[PDB]
Amino acid sequence: NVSAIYTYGQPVPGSVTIKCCREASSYYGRKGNCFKGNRGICTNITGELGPDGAFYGVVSLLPFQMGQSGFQMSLGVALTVTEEGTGIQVTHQFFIMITSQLATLIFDYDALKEFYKRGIPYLVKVILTDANDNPMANEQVEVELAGKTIGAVLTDKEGRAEYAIDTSSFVQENFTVVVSYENPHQCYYTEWEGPDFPTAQHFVMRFYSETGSFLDIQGSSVELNCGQVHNISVRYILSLDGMGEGATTATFYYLAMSRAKIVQHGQRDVHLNQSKSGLFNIGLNVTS
Amino acid sequence: GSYTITAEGESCESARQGFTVDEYILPRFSVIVDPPNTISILDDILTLNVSAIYTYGQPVPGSVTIKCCREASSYYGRKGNCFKGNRGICTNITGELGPDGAFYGVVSLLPFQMGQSGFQMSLGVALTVTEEGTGIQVTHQFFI
Amino acid sequence: LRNETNMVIIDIQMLSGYQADYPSLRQLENSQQVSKTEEQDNHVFLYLNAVPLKTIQLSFKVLIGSRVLNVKSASVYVYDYYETGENGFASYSQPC
Amino acid sequence: YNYGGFNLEEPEPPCEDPNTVIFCKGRYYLPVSSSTEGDTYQNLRRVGLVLGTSSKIRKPVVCGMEAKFSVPRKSSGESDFGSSLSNGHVETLRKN
């Protein structure tokens, strides 16, 4: 969807001719690959503009070879535009890369804390897209801890899968989990001797607690604007053998620092109405 | 069915002359080939030399519709995993002989790709031998 | 159909030299009514669960064993097992 | 904490023996620990605050499996700031 314009915003009628092609593979010659492939299957097109300056050059690829050995994974694109009176010609060359991996799924390196705690579920959020970074419709992916598939989760219509993995009864030490997309249907074709389907592993470490009672804060992918008090979230487990049973209320303590300065202290006292755990929202009043 | 004579001797060694028993009517004339069977990528055109004659040792009149072709392969490609792509190619050609009785002839190898990645490294061949009155033929299939 | 039989068998005669193929065979077996298949010395037996009052259509590829030929037409004979008397004849010319 | 050639880190507490055998309820047990783990002591010393409460914060580490492991310093922050800050993008001036 190309156009052009004069020095001061004036339409530029003329002939636009386009060539886009590439060599097949050209390995080595001699004891390598003497006569192999061709000089490159190549086309030549032309079009006219003039209303105000515009050309919508749709091009067929069927004559070109999709899925064969004449590949170099990028199409060299050449455009030359001329003018009726002045045979002057304006040229622009560039490469358009021919992709291999349709869809990819990735960890969110804003969430995904690396240090984990027993009994408090670990959340895993992974983002899937295709080609030109599009949201992925409802698809099913799989979460496998060591070799066992546990996730089998459908997405949220735009590739933002989140999963709550149990953490109770784990004394494990390495715990490299990995995630997978298994589907025998997509136009996907093993290329660089890699995974036979999309995969992504995170290696995480246990955090230490002598008695066991765990705390975490909900991360945010967005900035917090000035002067807007919010209710940022915290979750907590208190095991028995902590404060001492019978006192069903604990004080949690709160701190901020801007550059090197202890700022805006806080404290919240909370009743453990249920057995041992819960979560809280922190009403922090942000300031410039 | 299968029937067999078994015979034991003095020292209990036994011969088993087996054989089939299936009623049948003796058939056809003689056909002879001798394909090179080994073909390089830098080969231009497939020369040929195939003969055949009657049961009596004299040439027979007819034609030879030779079939020779090859698909590419399973061919998983390069986009991330599995799930193979598209289909392949074949052809149809013919030959004739009988006056002296010889096709010899050749096969245009050029239409078939050369040195590409669309191969399974061997070529299939299937013969044919016609007669005027008797449309009876003799079977011959192999690979190169 | 009513109160006569609930099982059927078709046999098919080969000719000259030619055969069907086992891939075609087990492709076919994954079809309705196909209780049993059999290939025997140019005689194809197909033992089918029951009979429809409607048309049931089956087809199969045929290779060529020995390409000696003769201008003859082969036949298929269908019947039932309870009483074998009720049966049907048909034939078919060679595709050559 | 190591700022301007000033360490400010207090020394580690004594280590534990690798052979003391303790039984609690079932089987009979020996110490073991991993160097690569996390404590509130490493939770801090990443921001820079300091506390001195008499309570434990440092994880007890038995001998034989101490820190070693060279110096595990990866990106540790995912920086995006820099210099130059210009690619080619040749759009020469087109306006008065």
XYZ file of C-alpha atoms in Angstrom:
624
model
C 0.000 0.000 0.000
C 2.479 2.545 -1.345
C 2.256 6.232 -2.210
C 4.431 9.217 -3.005
C 4.193 12.991 -2.847
C 6.068 16.070 -4.043
C 8.180 18.511 -2.056
C 5.135 20.548 -1.020
C 2.403 17.914 -0.953
C 1.550 17.415 -4.607
C 0.338 14.222 -6.306
C 2.937 12.379 -8.356
C 1.418 10.501 -11.320
C 3.730 8.064 -13.048
C 4.659 4.449 -13.622
C 5.551 2.246 -10.651
C 7.311 -1.014 -11.491
C 8.126 -3.634 -8.872
C 10.516 -6.584 -8.852
C 10.767 -8.949 -5.885
C 12.740 -12.196 -6.019
C 15.675 -14.076 -4.518
C 18.110 -16.913 -5.139
C 17.080 -20.441 -4.155
C 19.851 -21.679 -1.857
C 23.341 -21.486 -3.530
C 25.297 -23.722 -1.145
C 28.916 -23.997 -2.298
C 29.652 -24.997 -5.894
C 32.647 -27.305 -6.581
C 32.692 -30.187 -4.014
C 29.697 -28.396 -2.459
C 26.685 -27.745 -4.710
C 27.748 -26.897 -8.274
C 24.422 -26.674 -10.117
C 21.498 -26.459 -7.722
C 18.457 -24.258 -7.603
C 18.173 -21.530 -10.207
C 19.051 -17.888 -10.534
C 15.865 -17.243 -8.598
C 12.242 -17.276 -9.740
C 11.448 -13.608 -10.319
C 8.539 -11.458 -11.481
C 8.016 -7.919 -12.758
C 4.880 -5.805 -12.349
C 3.826 -2.242 -13.110
C 1.005 0.117 -12.180
C -0.210 3.678 -12.527
C -1.211 6.363 -10.038
C -2.390 9.945 -10.425
C -5.697 10.627 -8.587
C -3.741 11.980 -5.633
C -0.823 9.515 -5.437
C -1.414 5.910 -4.362
C -0.871 2.332 -5.519
C -2.258 -0.848 -3.959
C 0.027 -3.491 -5.436
C -1.517 -6.827 -4.572
C 0.811 -9.574 -5.786
C 0.254 -13.303 -6.164
C 2.757 -15.629 -4.551
C 1.478 -18.843 -6.142
C 3.985 -18.557 -9.030
C 6.696 -18.290 -6.380
C 7.701 -21.476 -4.589
C 6.239 -21.842 -1.104
C 7.480 -24.735 1.002
C 10.369 -25.981 -1.111
C 14.177 -25.972 -1.194
C 14.525 -22.674 -3.056
C 14.096 -20.871 0.234
C 16.015 -18.028 1.836
C 13.258 -16.847 4.224
C 13.252 -13.240 2.977
C 12.056 -11.649 -0.257
C 14.174 -8.815 -1.609
C 11.736 -6.085 -2.605
C 12.598 -3.500 -5.254
C 10.402 -0.521 -6.139
C 11.175 2.116 -8.755
C 8.758 4.966 -9.440
C 9.014 7.281 -12.440
C 7.219 10.361 -13.754
C 5.534 10.987 -17.094
C 7.378 14.103 -18.225
C 10.529 13.523 -16.216
C 11.828 10.010 -16.732
C 13.443 10.404 -13.314
C 13.129 7.264 -11.220
C 12.941 6.894 -7.441
C 14.083 3.524 -6.115
C 13.639 1.792 -2.758
C 14.967 -1.692 -2.006
C 14.339 -3.771 1.096
C 14.000 -7.353 2.299
C 10.753 -8.852 3.595
C 11.481 -11.807 5.844
C 9.622 -15.067 5.203
C 8.764 -16.469 8.610
C 8.859 -20.033 9.909
C 7.399 -20.067 13.426
C 3.695 -19.322 13.180
C 2.825 -19.063 16.877
C 4.891 -18.497 20.017
C 4.065 -18.541 23.730
C 6.153 -16.652 26.279
C 6.484 -16.163 30.043
C 5.525 -12.740 31.407
C 8.678 -11.257 32.892
C 6.711 -8.821 35.013
C 4.863 -11.456 37.000
C 6.449 -14.914 37.388
C 8.351 -14.441 40.606
C 11.153 -16.976 40.757
C 11.028 -17.811 44.490
C 8.213 -20.066 45.616
C 6.259 -20.993 48.752
C 4.418 -24.135 49.784
C 0.635 -24.378 49.756
C 0.213 -20.914 48.215
C -0.526 -21.514 44.514
C 2.005 -20.371 41.943
C 0.498 -18.431 39.075
C 1.854 -18.806 35.549
C 0.882 -16.327 32.832
C 1.963 -16.941 29.250
C 1.181 -15.045 26.074
C 0.617 -16.708 22.697
C 0.517 -15.045 19.291
C 0.991 -15.776 15.601
C 3.087 -14.234 12.853
C 2.368 -10.504 13.018
C 1.629 -10.359 16.757
C -2.079 -11.093 16.781
C -4.211 -12.178 19.740
C -4.866 -15.901 19.801
C -8.424 -17.176 19.897
C -9.458 -19.864 22.362
C -6.716 -22.477 22.218
C -5.652 -25.165 24.670
C -2.119 -25.341 26.064
C -0.511 -27.620 28.625
C 1.466 -27.075 31.837
C 3.933 -29.829 32.763
C 5.928 -29.619 35.992
C 8.522 -32.387 35.605
C 7.076 -34.749 33.018
C 3.396 -34.772 33.930
C 0.832 -32.637 32.133
C -1.314 -30.678 34.583
C -2.430 -27.469 32.866
C -4.621 -28.333 29.861
C -5.889 -24.763 29.981
C -7.942 -22.826 27.453
C -6.888 -19.255 26.793
C -8.802 -16.007 27.270
C -9.442 -15.366 23.572
C -6.265 -13.280 23.239
C -3.440 -15.572 24.361
C -3.062 -14.640 28.025
C -3.214 -18.004 29.778
C -2.904 -18.034 33.575
C -2.681 -21.156 35.729
C -2.746 -21.758 39.484
C -0.351 -24.596 40.281
C -0.588 -26.198 43.716
C 2.491 -25.707 45.878
C 1.568 -27.722 48.967
C 3.553 -30.867 49.735
C 6.588 -29.878 47.643
C 10.104 -30.198 49.068
C 11.649 -30.250 45.608
C 14.858 -28.387 44.839
C 15.295 -27.655 41.121
C 11.746 -27.517 39.716
C 12.150 -26.435 36.127
C 8.555 -26.389 34.955
C 7.763 -26.126 31.240
C 4.690 -25.257 29.174
C 3.650 -26.617 25.816
C 1.254 -26.215 22.925
C 0.252 -29.553 21.420
C -1.956 -29.502 18.352
C -1.632 -31.707 15.247
C -3.375 -29.202 12.987
C -1.494 -25.930 12.470
C 0.582 -25.009 9.426
C 3.844 -25.504 11.318
C 6.786 -27.575 10.068
C 9.859 -28.530 12.071
C 12.685 -26.263 11.004
C 15.738 -25.852 13.248
C 15.912 -29.321 14.841
C 14.090 -27.866 17.837
C 10.957 -28.593 19.838
C 8.367 -30.501 17.867
C 5.784 -27.991 19.179
C 5.953 -24.694 21.107
C 7.503 -25.038 24.563
C 8.860 -22.772 27.279
C 10.501 -23.727 30.568
C 11.051 -21.696 33.713
C 13.513 -22.775 36.400
C 12.544 -21.518 39.851
C 13.858 -21.794 43.391
C 12.216 -22.352 46.750
C 12.371 -19.563 49.291
C 13.266 -20.445 52.869
C 11.080 -20.231 55.958
C 12.156 -21.838 59.220
C 8.601 -22.398 60.419
C 6.603 -21.758 57.269
C 4.345 -18.770 56.717
C 4.306 -17.071 53.390
C 3.519 -13.688 51.864
C 3.275 -12.261 48.356
C 2.222 -9.106 46.529
C 0.248 -8.953 43.284
C 2.342 -7.534 40.477
C 0.966 -5.021 38.001
C 1.854 -4.624 34.327
C 0.779 -0.967 34.358
C 2.103 2.220 35.906
C 0.351 3.831 38.878
C -0.683 7.407 38.156
C -0.200 10.285 40.591
C -2.649 11.221 43.315
C -4.768 8.072 42.930
C -4.980 5.984 46.076
C -5.296 2.344 45.051
C -5.871 -0.998 46.785
C -2.850 -3.049 45.673
C -3.159 -6.668 46.767
C -1.266 -8.980 49.128
C -1.826 -12.648 49.988
C -0.686 -14.454 53.118
C -0.540 -17.802 54.895
C 0.236 -18.091 58.601
C 0.998 -21.584 59.762
C 0.400 -22.672 63.297
C 3.476 -22.325 65.533
C 3.726 -18.618 64.699
C 2.203 -15.881 66.850
C 0.574 -18.395 69.162
C -2.952 -19.674 68.692
C -5.871 -17.809 70.230
C -4.804 -14.338 69.056
C -6.814 -14.117 65.841
C -5.394 -10.811 64.586
C -1.984 -9.864 63.222
C -0.353 -6.564 62.342
C 1.440 -6.370 59.003
C 3.872 -3.559 58.404
C 4.370 -1.397 55.404
C 7.143 0.672 53.866
C 8.061 2.683 50.783
C 11.265 4.268 49.482
C 11.561 6.589 46.483
C 15.277 7.151 45.783
C 17.154 6.496 49.021
C 14.566 7.823 51.474
C 12.231 5.900 53.769
C 8.824 7.267 52.743
C 5.171 6.848 53.717
C 5.191 4.200 56.422
C 2.116 2.081 57.006
C 0.571 -0.668 59.076
C -2.544 -2.810 58.772
C -4.112 -4.892 61.528
C -6.211 -7.802 60.287
C -8.370 -10.456 61.944
C -7.734 -14.043 60.850
C -11.431 -14.833 60.728
C -10.791 -18.046 58.793
C -8.322 -20.732 59.902
C -4.871 -19.615 58.768
C -4.777 -17.450 55.625
C -6.279 -14.731 53.478
C -5.372 -11.729 51.366
C -5.509 -7.950 51.608
C -5.704 -4.802 49.494
C -3.377 -1.962 50.431
C -4.915 1.501 50.276
C -1.737 3.360 49.366
C -2.190 7.067 48.614
C 0.371 7.701 45.878
C 1.971 11.146 45.666
C 4.137 13.037 43.186
C -2.789 -76.554 -2.417
C 0.690 -77.615 -1.387
C 1.671 -81.279 -1.585
C 4.946 -82.948 -0.735
C 6.647 -86.318 -0.954
C 8.518 -87.360 2.173
C 10.811 -90.382 2.222
C 12.842 -91.898 5.051
C 15.918 -94.017 4.408
C 17.822 -96.692 6.289
C 19.521 -94.198 8.611
C 16.220 -92.286 9.082
C 17.416 -89.356 6.978
C 14.382 -88.023 5.134
C 13.931 -86.102 1.902
C 11.009 -83.686 1.557
C 10.366 -82.860 -2.095
C 7.691 -80.220 -1.803
C 5.627 -78.728 -4.583
C 2.444 -76.869 -5.358
C -0.592 -78.356 -7.054
C -2.715 -75.716 -8.741
C -4.492 -76.303 -12.006
C -3.341 -73.896 -14.683
C -3.050 -73.313 -18.419
C 0.358 -72.421 -19.832
C 0.389 -68.953 -21.312
C 2.367 -66.359 -23.061
C 5.438 -65.491 -25.256
C 8.895 -64.209 -24.168
C 9.914 -60.661 -23.166
C 13.435 -59.496 -22.298
C 14.814 -56.330 -20.705
C 18.149 -55.240 -19.240
C 17.757 -51.824 -17.611
C 20.877 -49.957 -16.479
C 19.067 -49.536 -13.130
C 21.691 -47.030 -11.904
C 21.199 -43.383 -12.847
C 23.118 -40.274 -11.847
C 21.743 -36.817 -11.251
C 23.880 -35.554 -14.133
C 22.089 -37.708 -16.679
C 20.265 -36.124 -19.610
C 17.954 -38.658 -21.291
C 17.246 -42.295 -20.444
C 18.209 -44.485 -23.365
C 16.436 -47.826 -23.503
C 16.777 -51.282 -25.041
C 13.892 -53.734 -24.541
C 13.023 -56.724 -26.724
C 10.472 -59.527 -26.889
C 9.463 -62.342 -29.230
C 6.893 -65.095 -29.544
C 6.964 -68.446 -27.858
C 8.552 -69.441 -31.200
C 11.487 -67.038 -31.121
C 10.244 -64.525 -33.680
C 9.274 -60.873 -33.209
C 5.723 -59.944 -32.248
C 3.820 -56.854 -33.471
C 2.519 -54.369 -30.943
C 3.150 -51.301 -28.822
C 4.759 -50.588 -25.458
C 3.032 -48.012 -23.273
C 5.738 -47.387 -20.687
C 4.835 -45.840 -17.332
C 7.655 -44.193 -15.402
C 7.274 -41.734 -12.547
C 7.994 -40.922 -8.911
C 6.485 -38.902 -6.079
C 8.617 -36.653 -3.879
C 8.330 -37.824 -0.244
C 6.568 -37.451 3.093
C 8.483 -34.160 3.418
C 7.858 -32.460 6.679
C 8.894 -28.846 5.996
C 10.259 -25.835 7.931
C 7.657 -23.825 9.903
C 8.019 -25.348 13.403
C 6.533 -28.892 13.579
C 5.269 -31.906 11.609
C 2.101 -31.805 9.467
C 3.408 -32.423 5.898
C 2.641 -30.264 2.840
C 1.579 -30.935 -0.766
C 1.421 -33.601 -3.510
C 3.730 -34.787 -6.294
C 4.022 -35.662 -9.994
C 3.894 -38.464 -12.562
C 3.638 -38.800 -16.341
C 2.457 -40.928 -19.266
C 4.433 -41.911 -22.375
C 4.358 -44.699 -24.937
C 6.398 -46.764 -27.385
C 5.909 -48.940 -30.449
C 7.792 -51.682 -32.289
C 7.273 -54.850 -34.284
C 8.537 -54.515 -37.893
C 11.876 -55.846 -36.819
C 10.631 -55.589 -33.242
C 12.514 -53.138 -31.053
C 11.641 -49.903 -29.331
C 15.083 -49.002 -28.000
C 14.057 -45.373 -27.706
C 14.569 -42.919 -24.881
C 12.860 -41.060 -22.032
C 12.991 -37.279 -21.631
C 14.362 -36.953 -18.109
C 14.318 -33.152 -18.157
C 10.674 -32.574 -17.074
C 11.515 -34.394 -13.861
C 13.296 -32.204 -11.344
C 17.040 -32.525 -10.937
C 18.932 -32.197 -7.678
C 16.007 -30.521 -5.902
C 14.492 -31.615 -2.574
C 11.440 -33.244 -4.137
C 12.760 -36.771 -4.500
C 12.618 -40.234 -3.000
C 15.792 -41.262 -4.866
C 14.252 -44.021 -7.065
C 12.006 -44.112 -10.128
C 9.176 -46.556 -10.864
C 8.837 -48.288 -14.243
C 6.001 -50.420 -15.668
C 5.963 -51.955 -19.152
C 3.306 -52.982 -21.709
C 3.178 -55.262 -24.770
C 0.268 -55.115 -27.204
C -0.845 -57.322 -30.071
C -3.316 -56.643 -32.854
C -5.867 -59.344 -32.096
C -4.871 -60.282 -28.547
C -4.852 -57.336 -26.175
C -2.903 -59.614 -23.861
C 0.179 -58.185 -22.162
C 3.083 -59.346 -19.983
C 3.714 -57.844 -16.568
C 6.922 -55.958 -15.825
C 7.464 -53.449 -13.015
C 10.654 -52.353 -11.264
C 12.661 -49.370 -10.013
C 15.780 -47.417 -10.946
C -36.226 -57.487 4.383
C -38.949 -58.118 6.938
C -38.762 -61.457 8.749
C -36.572 -63.073 6.082
C -32.940 -62.332 6.958
C -30.765 -60.038 9.008
C -27.351 -60.965 7.538
C -25.880 -60.865 4.033
C -22.796 -62.030 2.105
C -21.437 -60.923 -1.286
C -18.740 -62.729 -3.220
C -16.892 -61.129 -6.111
C -15.013 -62.921 -8.875
C -11.651 -61.716 -10.145
C -10.275 -62.432 -13.618
C -7.097 -62.881 -15.663
C -4.495 -61.353 -13.407
C -5.439 -58.467 -11.118
C -6.195 -57.947 -7.438
C -7.410 -55.371 -4.962
C -5.071 -54.010 -2.282
C -4.886 -54.566 1.461
C -4.780 -50.783 2.117
C -8.080 -50.497 0.271
C -9.294 -53.493 2.254
C -8.746 -52.145 5.734
C -9.827 -48.711 4.588
C -13.104 -50.376 3.630
C -13.468 -52.391 6.824
C -13.970 -49.150 8.782
C -17.417 -48.789 7.245
C -20.900 -49.582 8.470
C -22.218 -53.165 8.149
C -18.707 -54.457 7.404
C -18.582 -57.311 9.880
C -16.042 -59.439 8.018
C -13.884 -59.412 4.899
C -12.054 -62.203 3.106
C -9.880 -62.609 0.019
C -9.649 -66.122 -1.415
C -8.128 -67.227 -4.738
C -9.901 -64.660 -6.956
C -13.041 -64.775 -4.790
C -13.804 -61.865 -2.467
C -16.147 -62.719 0.398
C -17.817 -59.864 2.259
C -19.839 -60.856 5.322
C -22.126 -57.927 6.146
C -24.113 -57.489 9.337
C -27.537 -56.947 7.777
C -29.397 -55.643 4.724
C -30.772 -52.149 4.057
C -34.020 -51.472 2.232
C -31.996 -48.631 0.695
C -28.996 -48.668 -1.603
C -25.663 -49.533 0.017
C -22.624 -48.763 -2.112
C -19.087 -50.085 -1.716
C -16.072 -49.661 -3.979
C -12.431 -50.708 -3.943
C -9.284 -50.133 -5.964
C -7.967 -53.019 -8.057
C -4.304 -53.568 -8.855
C -3.116 -55.839 -11.666
C -1.068 -58.909 -10.818
C -0.271 -60.406 -14.223
C -1.283 -58.198 -17.117
C -2.304 -61.108 -19.353
C -5.770 -60.215 -20.575
C -8.888 -61.791 -22.027
C -12.229 -60.259 -23.008
C -14.310 -61.751 -20.213
C -16.791 -60.315 -17.716
C -16.749 -61.325 -14.062
C -19.643 -61.729 -11.653
C -20.768 -60.996 -8.101
C -23.195 -63.269 -6.257
C -24.963 -62.138 -3.082
C -26.974 -64.243 -0.652
C -28.034 -64.693 2.975
C -26.970 -67.135 5.671
C -30.196 -68.148 7.445
C -31.586 -69.736 4.307
C -29.052 -69.426 1.525
C -31.670 -69.764 -1.223
C -32.636 -66.105 -1.559
C -29.748 -64.609 -3.493
C -28.825 -62.301 -6.346
C -26.662 -62.430 -9.469
C -24.788 -59.663 -11.230
C -21.831 -59.257 -13.553
C -19.511 -56.558 -14.846
C -17.201 -56.212 -17.812
C -13.503 -55.653 -17.440
C -12.417 -51.987 -17.528
C -10.258 -53.000 -20.491
C 25.932 -3.035 50.516
C 29.495 -2.816 49.118
C 29.522 0.893 48.270
C 32.597 3.036 47.693
C 35.038 0.378 48.830
C 33.008 0.102 52.041
C 31.659 -3.381 52.703
C 29.336 -2.876 55.712
C 28.450 -6.597 55.695
C 28.552 -8.379 59.026
C 30.295 -11.777 59.111
C 28.415 -15.027 58.694
C 27.523 -17.098 61.775
C 29.203 -20.443 62.523
C 28.569 -23.473 60.319
C 27.099 -26.853 61.263
C 28.730 -30.288 61.293
C 27.933 -32.740 58.492
C 27.482 -35.837 60.669
C 25.148 -35.073 63.596
C 22.325 -37.600 63.459
C 18.885 -36.618 64.736
C 15.664 -38.605 64.914
C 12.261 -36.951 65.309
C 9.325 -39.263 64.569
C 10.129 -41.944 61.987
C 13.413 -42.599 60.259
C 16.903 -41.415 61.215
C 18.097 -38.287 59.519
C 21.217 -36.316 58.473
C 21.610 -32.661 57.499
C 21.534 -31.370 53.956
C 21.055 -27.932 52.430
C 21.234 -26.055 49.146
C 23.509 -23.100 48.600
C 21.262 -21.622 45.914
C 18.137 -20.680 47.852
C 16.566 -17.528 49.253
C 16.149 -15.951 52.690
C 14.805 -12.626 53.923
C 18.487 -11.782 54.322
C 18.802 -11.961 50.534
C 15.366 -10.375 50.209
C 16.986 -7.345 51.748
C 20.550 -6.499 50.673
C 18.853 -6.144 47.271
C 17.130 -2.894 48.196
C 19.744 -1.693 50.690
C 17.808 -1.347 53.957
C 19.360 -2.709 57.146
C 17.762 -4.330 60.193
C 19.294 -5.682 63.368
C 16.439 -7.408 65.160
C 17.588 -10.141 67.518
C 15.451 -12.693 65.669
C 16.887 -15.003 63.026
C 16.856 -13.849 59.411
C 19.794 -15.838 58.067
C 19.221 -19.426 57.039
C 21.319 -21.999 58.925
C 23.779 -23.586 56.527
C 25.541 -26.838 57.336
C 29.088 -27.372 56.125
C 29.975 -29.041 52.846
C 27.613 -27.171 50.501
C 28.530 -23.497 50.938
C 28.048 -20.669 48.450
C 30.930 -21.272 45.975
C 29.545 -21.252 42.412
C 31.696 -18.373 41.092
C 29.582 -15.202 40.962
C 25.966 -15.635 39.783
C 25.354 -12.129 38.408
C 22.958 -12.090 35.459
C 21.287 -8.966 34.020
C 19.449 -8.457 37.345
C 17.128 -5.651 36.317
C 16.520 -5.861 32.544
C 18.008 -2.495 31.594
C 16.711 -0.394 28.696
C 18.581 2.898 29.245
C 21.559 3.748 27.061
C 23.274 6.124 24.630
C 23.514 6.802 20.872
C 19.730 6.224 20.666
C 19.597 6.513 16.873
C 19.261 3.986 14.065
C 19.545 4.835 10.390
C 15.983 5.967 9.583
C 17.168 8.455 6.954
C 14.276 10.903 6.611
C 16.182 13.980 5.504
C 14.518 17.309 6.245
C 11.474 17.859 4.026
C 9.955 21.062 5.391
C 10.506 24.814 5.452
